Design an enzyme around this catalytic site. Structure first.
Site, PDB file in Angstrom:
ATOM      1  N   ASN A 118       2.226  -4.885   8.817  1.00 19.16           N
ATOM      2  CA  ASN A 118       3.397  -4.110   8.425  1.00 19.16           C
ATOM      3  C   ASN A 118       3.866  -3.173   9.529  1.00 19.16           C
ATOM      4  OD1 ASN A 118       0.919  -2.578   7.730  1.00 19.16           O
ATOM      5  ND2 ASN A 118       2.341  -1.021   6.967  1.00 19.16           N
ATOM      6  N   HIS A 119       3.056  -2.945  10.562  1.00 22.80           N
ATOM      7  CA  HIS A 119       3.502  -2.140  11.692  1.00 22.80           C
ATOM      8  C   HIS A 119       4.210  -2.956  12.765  1.00 22.80           C
ATOM      9  CE1 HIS A 119       1.853   1.991  11.020  1.00 22.80           C
ATOM     10  NE2 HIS A 119       1.203   1.329  10.079  1.00 22.80           N
TER      11      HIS A 119
HETATM   12 MN    MN Z   1      -1.160  -2.023   7.807  1.00 22.62          MN
END
Ligand code: MN
EC number: 3.1.3.16
Lengths: 293, 7
Positions: A118-119
């Site tokens: 998610n980064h």
């Molecule tokens: Mn993460």
């Protein structure tokens, strides 16, 4: 693109001063992004991988801990690798981290694999460090180049039809593996839906079914959701990351799920280890661990 | 505790 020169300069700081930088040229890094992006797009978004291999969780820009993991487990291609995302943000050296991983992806594209966390997402890395690092050490144009590359990363992997791997976790919209395969690239991470959940969701011992996620997006899921999922798809284990765990690894739902976190000394409330999971030829799992300082 | 987007 001189891959061996790029890799050599990145490895040269092994044993060097605390946090010595490796400053590649802007053209070298652009080449890394463009060539690796091409490779990601040529390979499935749902990777089908074979053991033996080593699987790493979050690195979060801790480049010298990445080097220790390769030291412990063998520098590519001495061992096959699957990373589960979150290479950038938070740490002091996201650039060296992502550049070495992309260089290894280009050099050994069939023996080295990177999933999306998610980064690996522009709106997240604008807040949590990677944007400021790119702007300080290069320019924002290169940061956009990284984002274009991040948008083509694969999202999940299945090891020998038995181990399902993703950064975050399960989704209430995930009923068939074909749903993952139908996702088109390049794409950003949405604030909702299957792709979001695969990168954001968390398992929870105190939830039954699906619950609200304290991160403000996606969901939490309980042990029965995991059990039902493994049965429906004839899998033995879910392997994910995303959550800091004190021992570097933590099993869940009677060893039906495992969390991997590979960045030691990360958390502010407790001293966590970093763990790398070794999967041998028969899918037996062991661990190589960076103990906290 | 670093800030919940996440210790
Ligand atoms: Mn993460």
């Amino acid at each position: 693109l001189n891959l061996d020169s790029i890799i050599g300069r990145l490895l040269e700081v092994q044993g060097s001063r605390p946090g010595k930088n490796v400053q590649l040229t802007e053209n070298e890094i652009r080449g890394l992004c463009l060539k690796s992006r091409e490779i990601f797009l040529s390979q499935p978004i749902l990777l089908e991988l074979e053991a033996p291999l080593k699987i790493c969780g979050d690195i979060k820009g801790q480049y010298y801990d990445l080097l220790r993991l390769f030291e412990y487990g063998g520098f590519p291609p001495e061992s096959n690798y699957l990373f589960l995302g979150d290479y950038v943000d938070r740490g002091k050296q996201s650039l060296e981290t992502i550049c070495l991983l992309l260089a290894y992806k280009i050099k050994y594209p069939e023996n080295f694999f990177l999933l999306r966390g998610n980064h690996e997402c522009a709106s997240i890395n604008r807040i949590y460090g990677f944007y400021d690092e790119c702007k300080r050490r290069y320019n924002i144009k290169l940061w956009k180049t990284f984002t274009d590359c991040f948008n083509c990363l694969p999202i999940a992997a299945i090891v020998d039809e038995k181990i399902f791997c993703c950064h975050g976790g399960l989704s209430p919209d995930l009923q068939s593996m074909e749903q993952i395969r139908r996702i088109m690239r390049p794409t950003d991470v949405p604030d909702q839906g299957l792709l979001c959940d695969l990168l954001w969701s968390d398992p929870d011992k105190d939830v039954q079914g699906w619950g609200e996620n304290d991160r403000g997006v996606s969901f939490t899921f309980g042990a029965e959701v995991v059990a039902k999922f493994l049965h429906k798809h004839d899998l033995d284990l879910i392997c994910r990351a995303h959550q800091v765990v004190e021992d570097g690894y933590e099993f869940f739902a009677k060893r039906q799920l495992v969390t991997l976190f590979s960045a030691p000394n990360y958390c502010g409330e407790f001293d966590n280890a970093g763990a790398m999971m070794s999967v041998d030829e028969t899918l037996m799992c062991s661990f190589q661990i960076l103990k906290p300082a | 505790x670093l800030x919940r987007x996440x210790x």
